[PDB]
Design a protein around this nucleic acid. Structure first.
Lengths: 26, 709, 120, 240, 54
RNA sequence: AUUAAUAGGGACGGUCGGGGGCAUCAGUAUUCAAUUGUCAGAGGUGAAAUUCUUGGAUUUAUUGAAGACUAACUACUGCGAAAGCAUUUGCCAAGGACGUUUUCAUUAAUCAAGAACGAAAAACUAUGCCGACUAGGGAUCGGGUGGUGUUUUUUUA
């Protein structure tokens, strides 16, 4: 559960991760 | 799961946001043991932290049983006294963290959290996509089971005063700041009390509420739907208990000598529906009896009466979806049929009873070989015949249900296929002779079984019982299996696939069918709604013209799939919910890349990891055989059949793409239009286009009369 | 039409328990001991005591409504004797003459499979 | 201590005035048997209080009754067998029993045991599809042919061990392929032991073959829908 | 149906009696051999098939 | 550069056994306990007493644990060097006989001494000429060969 779970949450966080350029714009 | 910090008390799902989550996980880092123990640690993983927090928040009740306390400035500790409301308490600020949190909503997240940890503690399958990669919160009638439209032509303040039976004074206004909060709270309480056992969870929706207002106005100004308040109408949403949906009595407190306080509450609340009954077993209780009906359920009837009684005389209750669906189910030609509910199986049981009588009259007849077994295997015997079994109704294509007659073992059988079948017919002849000579009320004749390719001698004995039923009898030995494997051996490579397909068909009719019947019946008695769902699904397929090339058993297994795999959703307890979950599952299903693993098991013997991996290996092997899936579309498999091709074989990829297309059309229609009679009727309409030719046939006689519908 | 009660008759060499019971085997209806039905104490297993005991518990059974009997008759069993007693024979005969319709007869003695007695 | 010579003991010092009239306070419940059997109706049983509806229900859930298969099944030979029926639902002067176990009777065992021939005993623990756990005991005595002249017919222990393994295989495949009603209907007309005989005639011909005993060990969480389905809710009548 | 079944069984048993008769009537090859044959086999064809398979 | 003893070993083969070791599984009883009934006695004996019982004994019912033992089948017997061994399924080695156109070639027989194994209230009406020894006779257990029909089953064990 742990290994595939880390892979899956890594993919998820990469997909939902935000843009630093937008962060500094705000 | 549709949860944020939005105000739950106002009649919508919520009261719990990411801020609240962060607060509570920080509190679990602070502590939280019953011995004020620290629960988590600063050097855990997200997976560890998430599992631990879910475990705690699911196991610990925070409203009725106990509360959680800490100091924001120290050790967290759970105290086993509930405050009748979700209570996380900083003792440095006296703040309940969860004051926006309706207790009903707390119960709902408790159930979701239990499902979350159950999926997590499953170690076999890939639970990540159910855990995170689906929004359940989109469709109301999929997420919940019974939602009812509640019209309130309220009007203005004095119209409220004369129409609302509830009093709106200063104490109502001080414990519930807004009229809408008071209204939602009152409706929640009255529905909870008037239903009680029959349900699992309740939710209220203020359709027409908004949060945006300009700087131009003092507040939000509305005129929506007679009222001038921040809603159009009310919708009630119910997660319903399955086996309590049809309880013709609703028990209250016990009849004591004086008037007990709870019986006073019940009788004041019910009044005209309150009564005293004397039962069978020497009991005297207060009850509010009902009546049962096919098209509408008892929940609908009671919810109309109770809300009209204790809210307003102008309120309106509806669910045309559920009433339409119940009408789309066929109705028997049995007395009092409309009064008979949808969870009553009396016709099936009558069938089974006359079979038991026949079981006596055959099983003790005199014969060459002693009878080893008689096995019903029939569709009706697993409760999946669309039309219910009506006496003397021989217009039903599935009227003659099927029953195996297995004799003992004896090595004097012929070792030739045709002579083998002819000897079996000789057995049936002897049985028919004895049965005619002794059992004159029965009737009997013989028929040619042509379901099996390249095997022409098979004769089955159809017997008609004077309860108005018909059983077809076929015989089974061990020489059948041995000979068929012998034939595949002595086949040549040009003909070997055809003999393999024929062997598969024989297996489906004679060996897997008994396991199929046993398993599905034994599980349907737990999942009551599965039989109406699968009958409705059969009606749907017969409208969409696919039953000619889809057998029964494929339909049955893909029907039971959402029941046995509710997660992330729930177990369906209402016909609309189950039917639409099945269609949703078909639409999501990518049979070119998805296997299907069915654990036909009572709720929480299941499949081991080795079996799961073995079937997954078989799935990978067939995908390697044909990634196009041209010769094999569906891979549906279970413990009763890991090969899977047994039921899913013998179909055109045009038929499969037609079915997938119809699923996608239905899902798009539900995504676009909304739930109403026009969309339901349009689903039940056929296409009758998109073809190369259409040929329209009219029989000499309309068979509804002899079909008994 | 008929109602059955089971009659468990322990019949040792020292006493005789007539024991009527409802059909489930839990709720005793009445039980009567030859020892309590004889004034003496060397008679406390005799057929006379058994006849009196059986007659009296038959009276109580007809009072409750019991009409017929499945009789289960028991010796000491165990490592000791395995034959019913004088009370067993006399009790069965007395009930049948009292007038309850005897249903059916069985000999349920605890026989050891493997006796708790060491060799040497 | 009845008679006048019999001395007092600690005994009859503080007695109890029997006044309660237990067979006034009691109440009669009818029981009923599952649908796999012919003569379904049997038996009335007592409950030690009436004034507990739920307390009475607790007693009748606890019960275990047992009855002769003859009168349970019409055929008036008391067919030397017992069915233990367990009561696990109540509804209105009707107890809805369920199957609990089975045994032969000791007189039948004496009726088969004989001197110059050996017996074979297999005792396999299995699981039905309904997750019941069973322990089935099966017995079989060897026999002499229609031809012999030797005075005794003993089995060599190769033949015994191959028979014991064969009996084990047939029992466990048949009961794992059953459900519990399907078992009960198999067990009633004695078809297992014809299967055993026909599959062991190639080893050393046995005569006297039986399913001796069945012991239940495990039950699942209780199943109202299943049980009332296996037998095959109601308006009151308006006291005013 | 009765007539078909009866004539079919009669014909088939005529064939099978011939089959056991031949396979256990002491088959001897041309130059002094002998074919071993078990008890209760019935089909010299089936012996051919066992030969072909293994 | 011998023969291959109805001399001895040893190999192989299919078996045979209640022989042994560790492990496992089951059986009813008995003892202890929980829970349930009903009511005044139970137990034991030439007769009784000590003893246990209105905080319910004995009795009945559902279950739980605990240690032992392995009934009937059990002898005209089986295996073991003797003392001895008795429900199942494994595992570890060992063994007799029989089969054998295998292999070695006198490797041997009886034994004072010496070494291994050997529960241990016991015993108490038994008792037979023996011997290096000739033919048998009936059943019996283990293996082997032929003949023969019944029980058996037939391309998968």
């Amino acid at each position: 559960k742990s290994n595939i779970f880390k892979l899956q949450i890594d993919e998820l966080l990469e997909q939902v991760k935000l843009k630093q350029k937008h962060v500094l714009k705000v | 799961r549709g949860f944020s910090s939005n105000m739950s008390h106002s009649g919508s799902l919520g009261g719990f946001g990411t801020f609240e989550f962060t607060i509570l996980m920080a509190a679990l880092l602070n502590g939280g043991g019953i011995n004020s123990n620290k629960i988590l640690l600063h050097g855990f993983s997200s997976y560890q932290l998430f599992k631990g927090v879910i475990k705690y928040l699911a196991t610990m009740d925070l409203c009725h049983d106990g509360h959680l306390q800490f100091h924001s400035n120290p050790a967290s500790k759970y105290i086993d006294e509930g405050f009748q409301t979700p209570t996380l308490f900083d003792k440095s600020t006296k703040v309940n963290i969860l004051t926006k949190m309706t207790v009903s909503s707390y119960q709902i997240l408790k159930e979701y959290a239990g499902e979350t940890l159950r999926m997590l503690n499953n170690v076999v399958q890939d639970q990540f996509s159910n855990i995170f990669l689906t929004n359940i919160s989109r469709f109301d009638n999929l997420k919940y089971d019974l939602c009812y439209d509640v019209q309130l032509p309220l009007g203005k303040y004095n119209n409220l005063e004369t129409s609302l039976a509830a009093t709106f004074g200063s104490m109502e206004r001080v414990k519930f700041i807004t009229l809408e909060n008071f209204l939602a709270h009152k409706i929640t309480n009255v529905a909870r009390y008037a239903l009680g056992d029959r349900i699992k969870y309740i939710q209220i929706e203020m359709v027409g509420q908004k949060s945006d207002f300009p700087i131009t106005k003092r507040k939000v100004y509305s005129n929506t739907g007679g009222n001038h308040f921040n809603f159009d109408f009310v919708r009630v949403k119910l997660i319903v208990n399955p086996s309590e949906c049809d309880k013709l009595v609703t028990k209250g407190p016990a009849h004591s000598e004086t008037m007990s306080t709870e019986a006073a509450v019940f009788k004041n609340f019910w009044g005209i529906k309150s009564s005293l009954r004397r039962f069978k077993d020497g009991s005297i209780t207060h009850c509010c009896v009902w009546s049962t009906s096919s098209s509408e359920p008892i929940i609908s009837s009671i919810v109309n009466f109770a809300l009209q009684k204790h809210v307003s005389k102008k309120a309106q209750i509806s669910n045309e979806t559920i009433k339409k669906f119940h009408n789309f189910l066929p109705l028997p030609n049995l007395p009092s049929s409309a009064k008979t509910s949808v969870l009553n199986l009396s016709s099936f049981f009558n069938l089974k009873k006359s079979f038991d009588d026949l079981y006596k009259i055959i099983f003790q007849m005199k014969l060459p070989l002693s009878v080893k077994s008689i096995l019903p295997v029939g569709s009706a015997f697993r409760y999946t015949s669309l039309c219910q079994p009506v006496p003397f109704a021989y217009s039903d294509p599935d009227f003659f249900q099927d029953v195996i007659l297995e004799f003992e073992t004896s090595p004097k059988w012929p070792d030739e296929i045709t002579s083998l079948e002819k000897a079996k017919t000789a057995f049936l002849l002897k049985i028919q002779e004895e049965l005619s000579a002794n059992s004159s009320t029965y009737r009997s004749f013989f028929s040619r079984d042509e379901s099996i390719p390249y095997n022409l001698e098979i004769v089955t004995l159809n017997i008609l019982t004077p309860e108005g039923y018909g059983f077809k009898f076929r015989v089974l030995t061990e020489r059948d299996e041995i000979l068929y494997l012998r034939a595949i051996a002595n086949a040549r490579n040009e003909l070997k696939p055809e003999l393999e397909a024929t062997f598969l068909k024989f297996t489906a009719k004679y060996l897997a069918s008994v396991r199929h019947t046993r398993t599905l019946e034994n599980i349907s008695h737990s999942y009551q709604f599965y039989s109406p769902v699968v009958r409705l699904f059969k009606r749907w397929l017969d409208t969409h013209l696919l039953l000619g090339h889809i057998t029964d058993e494929l339909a049955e297994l893909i029907a039971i799939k959402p029941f046995v795999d509710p997660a992330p959703y729930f177990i369906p307890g209402s016909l609309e919910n189950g039917f639409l979950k099945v269609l949703k599952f078909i639409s999501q299903w990518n049979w070119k890349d998805d296997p299907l693993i069915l654990d036909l098991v009572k709720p929480e013997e299941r499949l081991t990891l080795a079996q799961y991996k073995g079937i997954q290996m078989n799935f990978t092997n067939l995908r390697n055989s044909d990634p196009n899936g041209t010769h094999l579309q569906f891979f549906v498999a279970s413990k009763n059949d890991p090969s899977g091709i047994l039921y899913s074989s013998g179909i055109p990829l045009p038929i499969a793409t037609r079915l997938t297309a119809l699923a996608k059309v239905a899902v798009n229609l539900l995504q676009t239009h909304g739930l109403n009679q026009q969309t339901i009727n349009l689903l039940f309409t056929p296409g009758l286009k998109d073809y190369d030719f259409v040929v329209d046939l009219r029989t000499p006689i309309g068979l509804k009369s002899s079909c008994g519908i | 039409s008929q109602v059955f009660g089971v009659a468990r008759i322990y019949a040792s060499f020292n006493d005789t328990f007539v024991h009527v019971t409802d059909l489930s085997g839990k709720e005793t209806i009445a039980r009567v001991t030859g020892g309590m039905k004889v004034k003496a104490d060397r008679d406390e297993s005799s057929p006379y005591a058994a006849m009196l005991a059986a007659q009296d518990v038959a009276a109580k059974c007809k009072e409750v409504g019991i009409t017929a009997v499945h009789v289960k008759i028991r010796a000491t069993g165990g490592t000791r004797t395995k034959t019913p007693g004088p009370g067993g024979q006399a009790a069965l005969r007395a009930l049948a003459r009292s007038g309850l319709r005897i249903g059916r007869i069985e000999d349920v003695t605890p026989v050891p499979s493997d006796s708790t007695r060491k060799k040497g | 201590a009845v008679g006048k010579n019999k001395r007092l003991s600690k005994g009859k010092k503080g007695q109890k005035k029997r006044v309660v009239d237990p067979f006034t306070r009691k109440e009669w419940f009818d029981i009923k048997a599952p649908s796999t059997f012919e003569n379904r109706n049997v038996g009335k049983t007592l409950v030690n209080k009436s004034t507990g509806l739920k307390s009475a229900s607790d007693a009748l859930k606890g019960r275990v009754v047992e009855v002769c298969l003859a009168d349970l099944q019409g055929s008036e030979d008391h067919s030397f067998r017992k069915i233990k029926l367990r009561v696990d639902e109540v509804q209105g002067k009707n107890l809805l029993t369920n199957f609990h176990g089975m045994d032969f009777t000791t007189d039948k065992l004496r009726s088969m045991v004989r001197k110059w021939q050996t017996l074979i005993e297999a005792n396999v623990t299995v699981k039905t599809s309904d997750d019941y756990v069973l322990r089935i005991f099966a017995i079989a005595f060897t026999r002499k042919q229609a031809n012999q002249v030797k005075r005794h017919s003993y089995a060599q222990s190769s033949h015994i061990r191959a028979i014991r393994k064969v009996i084990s295989e047939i029992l466990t495949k048949e009961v794992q392929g059953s459900t519990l009603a399907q078992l009960t209907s198999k067990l009633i007309p004695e078809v297992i032991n014809k299967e055993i005989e026909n599959a062991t005639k190639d080893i050393f011909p046995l005569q006297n073959i039986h399913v001796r005993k069945v012991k239940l060990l495990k039950q699942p969480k209780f199943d109202v829908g299943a049980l009332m389905a296996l037998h095959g809710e109601e308006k009151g009548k308006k006291v005013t | 149906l009765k007539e078909d079944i009866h004539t079919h069984m009669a014909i088939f048993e005529q064939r099978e009696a011939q089959a056991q008769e031949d396979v256990q009537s002491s088959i001897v090859d041309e130059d002094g051999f002998t074919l071993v044959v078990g008890k209760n086999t019935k089909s010299l064809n089936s012996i051919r098939k066992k030969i072909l398979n293994k």
